[PDB]
Design a protein around this ligand. Structure first.
Ligand SMILES: [Mg+2]
Ligand SMILES: [Mg+2]
Lengths: 429, 441, 441, 429
């Protein structure tokens, strides 16, 4: 039915989806136990395309658990809504990748892929007209990417028609949570540029910036952050989940978002984002949220539209309004800062609306535009990879996995090729 | 005896359809379930609802129209909506996975998937019908099946019957407002496969709906409800002759090779009026001359293409209500009078009156005020080629950059379809280019 | 005066029978015990129930049909069921150990065991009857006695009376759906011993029952209840003439050498309609033309053999209810009209009308909706030979591998029965091969 | 009435049938005492075809006890439902076979067969239209097979029309509970290929795998295992015991299962099999249980359908459903993995349904298909027999029974002949 599935690895991402399904449960108001306690059939109408009824009305996720060590499995296993799960999917590891990506990709990569792809495949038979599935990990290591690389390869072959919308955490330029990041990252991204269908960037520092400045929060954790992102990743299917006077699916999205298949790394904007007092400063209009939409500070990725140029831009609106406003602000904005709008893409802004906003708010905005400002991102990470690969720093942890360096060259001149590729598209008219 | 049937496609398109059948059912006032509030007396002289609302052996009078689109969510709302007693299950055919606005998908890829079901339904209705004149087909160059799958639809339906009229209501990419960017691809790929499968059809653009509803309906913040209501009115009157007594109950087939004199450039504008408020319904009088002179306001032009930049060819000002042949007639002299307007002189006058005696009915909850007289200026000029030219230039460059082409080439279309379809708008550019040339001497 | 009697065999077969007598008893509304709700007035002009329901000296009116099968479990359910007042003990003959789907067992081995009891019962009924036209025999190529023991049954019963008609309802191995794999053996071993002991009979396949009940009855999840109900309707109407006034109360013997012109290829299809829902009973009108044109939908073809791949020979569209000779008649012109259809031209038309005035009755708890008019398209074409060919090719190889043959050779059949029976389908393949040849010049 | 009897020997099998009749008692809800305490006559309708009423309504089994040492006789004699028995049948031995099969077959084989076949014969007169009888032992020794070999010979001659559906325990390839197994086994299997009508394979390691992985159990015993198998062997007669819209008996089964009489070694699948939490992951559908049906992990035998090819396959369904589903999944599956479906057997899958499932569950599934993957089984056991028969290891325990070795050759080239026989049928088209 255009239903989809979720698969998460990732040192964080395993938590991320926990929050995610948590949020969707709220938007479906079904008890933690797994039965519905809401007030409209509309939550039940399209419930299946994420959930699954069970005998007795156990309502369940179409999620897939990735992990190389059960702790997360216990963690979310210790999770509220944990009784809303299926024990089947608790597919984890006994070792952990140690985030040498070769470890999580050959060593443990080849070790535990099979049981996953089997049960996942059983989910594939459980899906009537599968629009797709949602993967989640991080692009700097192996706790997610280790195996998730193998996932994208295997299912991608196994389902060359299905959509692969991939969110994985990008290392911020400043803070290096690990120094093996350039290598895991580069080795992964070689794969992901080939095999993944959609990708959107996952920085932490942006999420900090949001929580601290625009959220005006002092105490950052993951969980709030995954609230902030699963807000958007939860919004994305809204029309696909719920009616909309102007609907567009991921196929309409990506096909209406990408000129050439190498450009499915997208940046993200969601809003509104206030602290409590703000409403008693300000109110909500479509033009208002628009005035956030093109905010670099909501630009939750390491790329700057202020520095790069919008190759593409789009808006995901959930609520009840007048599109006569919506479009009007659209075109207005597409003029107002025309210069950061790439040229030969006429009407490079594109529209949407969901008859219902997310719960709690009256109107919704989402922006997954695609400039080319990410070039500094790949340039950076490739740069650090370059330095220590001059040094071969921690190659020994690496070659101990029994990869070659020439692969590193492959993702290397590879990833540079993708960058310059974005250069010419940005530098053209 | 005089049947037509409606076909509905694309998100906005079936939105239009829903508004429409809401409308007509309101206008004959047959209750949403399928019954009239009261018994129908036996009489003769002309048809009634029987055109479209379908007689049962009881108070069950379903439209003669069909839904087809590969994006099946919204249609379910009809499947749920109040008229779930109105419509009929086999009236409903949808696709699950729509085109993603791949023209080539629901035209090619998913084009293959639901066609036969469609044609069977068509055979059930036309076999159910007798004097079905023509075909009401609605779709959109946006809700992607509205382009692709409809393209196959007429592509084959024409080859099925042929002799029926093609009544074409589809939406055209607004000039600067839009919905996507592949719209060039949708449109032109439609167009070269549209024309020779089309008889005649009109181009409704939205931005006019906005600007005019907001000024003339005094609308503050509109949407597809208002739009679909407005097109609901215009189609409501474009066929009254087959529904209601009028002095010159002109007909579609009558319109065909007379409005569009040549075979080729067979589309047109349509600025309905009088759309005003309850506070302008009063504080006004709304003369025949007001609707008439007002009918040719380029700023009233209900599709964003300046008439004053074009030269008119025909104008079928079919009228609802208390119309006078004389008064309108002299107004038409007034239209000959308009210096700014210029006509395909080799067609000096091509006018064709429509005076149907029922004035308009209003939909409760609507914004239009009530009047006594309606106009439909289905008129054809030289002007409309330009925005096409924008379409082929925009599409020209974007296609030159091969943008998105992977999407379509991935689904089974060839490149010469693209460049050649650009030759198609080349030719039609020669057509609006040539027919507008004034014949020598 | 005009009697028939039903015989029931094989698991699915007596399932069918149970559905049937449930049906007829419902339709004359005689209560399950054996009484009518009220007294019967003395009248003349035609028969009534007396055909099948058996008059007592009181409210005891038992069918004129007989149960025979060697798998006696399920029949006991009738022995237990609500109609345990309905039926009669000596009406019941079963075998304990069935065939195990050895054709050769209940045909040969256990074939010897219950025959005489069967024939005695037959003599009791036919002696009880007077103008018994023909014989209703039901069995199945699955519930193995349905093939074997029935094979002896007609094999001898024919030689007993002969002059009675053979009314053959048995099920045929669904084309890709099945029940076992020895089905080739059951079927063809039946067939060479079926034909020359058969007068005429129809081939009901299930997969059509599924697909059509699920689409046309809107069924989600069916079984033998729905199937047995459906065949219940079709037989319910195939004999109405002897039960109810119709304009042309055609008869079985009448059907015999007229539908099946030659002696050999004397089977046929049967797509009954109108099977629709309560929500399609409304939202519809169900014209004579709808049932009629609909009657020839190959996709409506109630046995999985494409009519469009064959050429029709005869069509006995016996009709229930308010039928018009004219309207149907012109529909038959419409059937001559159908280009896709092609007829054994040396039989240009062979049509034979049936207009019985009672429209259909519905069984409560059923899925079919109520209507005014019924059709039975007992029609015979060239098409049906093919699936046979699948049967003899499948069976061809499997038999070539000697699969299972030990089972049958163990029970007293010879190999030349196998190869020769394959010669039998060889000949019949020559028959559908030849009769379909268009006579020269 | 197609009633049948049971005969059990076997170091375990004597326990197995104990559990079995125990289970059937539950499905007939008759007290341990031997009177009915249930709620439908349906349990009484076809009760006789396993049970036997007694004067006063003592309801009794048609079972036959085999043993060469009374301990088991005391054991089950110490059994709950033990008051549901007839003291007559407690026919045991004073010695034990020591599992030298010649001991249990000549020595004690000839010693105690007579009293058995007599009383059994008295049961034969007690049977009106005996469909058959159920034997049980193990195929590696003599505690069952010792005499059960003689049973199959004697009754087989004595009743050349009756069905002999034989379940005996197969030694798993890994764990050798005894090393004389190849010899007992081979000597038996020579007989069983000739004389037994039906056979289904009885591994332990599969039952462990079921209990530990798919049952998710840590503590394996026999008794649970016999629960797992007497579940199936109890299901087999369901239609024969109870109505079914699609019924098929053992004659319809085997005749509808076997192409040539040498192929009555069948593998088994029964389901569902969950631990308690699973239902709150998943629910029951015909397609679901189907999705277990072709599971190698439910393939409770040493043969792999994943390695061999389904010569035949069948489904035993007890419950209330829509066969319109059932068939649909049937054919669907017969396509989906066509390659493991042998070719010239069109519709090599075959169907069934019982109007009632087993107690406690709503729907039942059983699979006794027959691939030819068992070839590795016989190849193994024959191989070990080969090795130590090169050595004559423990021939002295053996020839001390006064057999010849040429018999060992007979079952030897015999059993190899049967294997290669399955090779050609598998390797053909
Ligand atoms: Mg669509
Ligand atoms: Mg039978």
């Amino acid at each position: 039915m255009r239903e989809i599935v979720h698969i998460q690895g990732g040192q964080c991402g395993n938590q991320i989806g926990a929050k995610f399904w948590e949020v969707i449960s709220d938007e479906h108001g079904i008890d933690p136990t797994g039965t519905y306690h809401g007030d409209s059939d509309l939550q039940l109408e399209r419930i299946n395309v994420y959930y699954n009824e069970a005998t007795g009305g156990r309502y369940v996720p179409r999620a897939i658990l990735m992990d190389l060590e059960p702790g997360t499995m216990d963690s979310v296993r210790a999770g509220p809504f944990g009784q809303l799960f299926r024990p089947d999917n608790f597919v984890f590891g006994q070792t952990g990748a140690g985030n040498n990506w070769a470890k999580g990709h050959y060593t443990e990569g080849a070790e535990l892929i099979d049981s996953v792809l089997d049960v996942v495949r059983k989910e594939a038979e459980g899906c009537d007209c599968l629009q797709g599935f949602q993967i989640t990990h991080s692009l700097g290591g192996g706790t997610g990417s280790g195996m998730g690389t193998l996932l994208i390869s295997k299912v991608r072959e196994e389902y060359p028609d299905r959509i692969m919308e991939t969110f994985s955490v990008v290392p911020s330029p400043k803070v290096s949570d690990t120094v093996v990041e350039p290598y895991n990252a580069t080795l992964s991204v070689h794969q992901l540029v080939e095999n993944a269908d959609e990708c959107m960037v996952i920085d932490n520092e942006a999420l900090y910036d949001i929580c601290f400045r625009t959220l005006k929060l002092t105490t950052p954790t993951y969980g709030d952050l995954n609230h902030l992102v699963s807000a958007a990743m939860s919004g994305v299917t809204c029309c696909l989940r719920f009616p909309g006077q102007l609907n567009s699916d991921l196929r309409k999205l990506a096909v209406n978002l990408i000129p050439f298949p190498r450009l499915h790394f997208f940046m993200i904007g969601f809003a509104p984002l206030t602290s409590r007092g703000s409403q008693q400063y300000r109110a909500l209009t479509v033009p208002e949220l628009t005035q956030q939409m093109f905010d670099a500070k909501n630009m939750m990725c390491a790329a700057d539209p202020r520095h790069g140029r919008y190759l593409t831009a789009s808006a995901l609106f959930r609520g009840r309004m007048s599109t006569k406003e919506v479009d009007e602000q659209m075109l207005n904005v597409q003029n107002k800062n025309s210069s950061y709008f790439v040229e030969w893409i006429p009407n490079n802004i594109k529209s949407s609306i969901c008859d219902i906003p997310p719960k709690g708010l009256k109107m919704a905005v989402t922006f997954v535009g695609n400039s080319t400002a990410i070039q500094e991102m790949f340039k950076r990470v490739a740069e650090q990879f370059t330095a220590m690969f001059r040094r071969k720093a921690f190659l020994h942890w690496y070659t101990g996995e029994g990869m070659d360096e020439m692969e590193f060259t492959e993702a290397e001149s590879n990833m540079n090729d993708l960058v310059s590729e974005y250069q010419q598209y940005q530098d053209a008219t | 005896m005089r049947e037509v049937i409606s076909i509905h496609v694309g998100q906005g398109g079936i939105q239009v359809g829903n508004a429409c059948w809401e409308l007509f059912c309101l206008e004959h006032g047959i209750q949403p379930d399928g019954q009239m509030p009261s018994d129908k007396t036996i009489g003769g002289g002309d048809d009634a609802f029987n055109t479209f609302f379908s007689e049962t052996g009881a108070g069950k009078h379903v439209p003669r129209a069909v839904f087809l689109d590969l994006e099946p969510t919204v249609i379910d709302e009809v499947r749920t909506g109040t008229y779930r007693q109105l419509f009929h299950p086999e009236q409903l055919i949808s696709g699950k996975e729509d085109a993603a606005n791949n023209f080539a998908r629901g035209h090619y890829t998913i084009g293959k998937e639901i066609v036969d079901l469609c044609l069977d339904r068509i055979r059930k209705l036309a076999d159910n019908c007798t004097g079905l004149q023509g075909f009401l087909v609605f779709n959109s160059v946006g809700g992607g099946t509205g382009s692709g799958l409809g393209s196959l639809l007429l592509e084959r339906l024409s080859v099925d019957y042929g002799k029926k009229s093609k009544l074409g209501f589809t939406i055209y990419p607004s000039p600067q407002v839009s919905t996507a960017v592949v719209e060039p691809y949708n449109s032109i790929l439609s167009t070269h496969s549209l024309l020779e499968h089309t008889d005649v059809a009109v181009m409704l653009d939205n931005e006019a709906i906005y600007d005019i509803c907001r000024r003339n309906l005094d609308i503050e913040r509109p949407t597809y409800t208002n739009l679909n209501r407005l097109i609901a009115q215009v189609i409501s009157s474009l066929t009254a002759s087959l529904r209601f007594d009028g002095a010159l109950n002109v007909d579609i087939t009558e319109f065909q090779t007379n409005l569009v004199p040549y075979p080729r450039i067979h589309f047109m504008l349509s600025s309905y009026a009088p759309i005003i408020s309850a506070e302008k319904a009063y504080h006004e009088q709304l003369s025949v001359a007001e609707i008439t002179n007002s009918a040719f306001e380029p700023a009233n032009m209900m599709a964003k293409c300046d008439p004053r930049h074009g030269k008119y060819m025909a104008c079928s000002m079919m009228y609802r209500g208390d119309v006078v042949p004389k008064d309108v007639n002299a107004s038409i002299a007034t239209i000959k009078t308009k210096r700014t307007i210029q006509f395909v002189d080799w067609c000096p006058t091509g006018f064709k009156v429509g005076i149907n005696y029922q004035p308009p009915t209003v939909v409760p909850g609507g914004d239009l005020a009530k009047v006594m007289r309606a106009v439909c200026m289905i008129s054809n000029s030289t002007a409309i080629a330009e925005v096409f030219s924008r379409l082929d230039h925009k599409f020209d460059l974007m296609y030159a950059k091969r943008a998105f082409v992977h999407w379509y080439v991935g689904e089974g279309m060839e490149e010469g379809e693209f460049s050649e379809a650009r030759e198609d708008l080349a030719a039609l550019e020669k057509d609006y280019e040539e027919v507008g040339i004034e014949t020598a001497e």
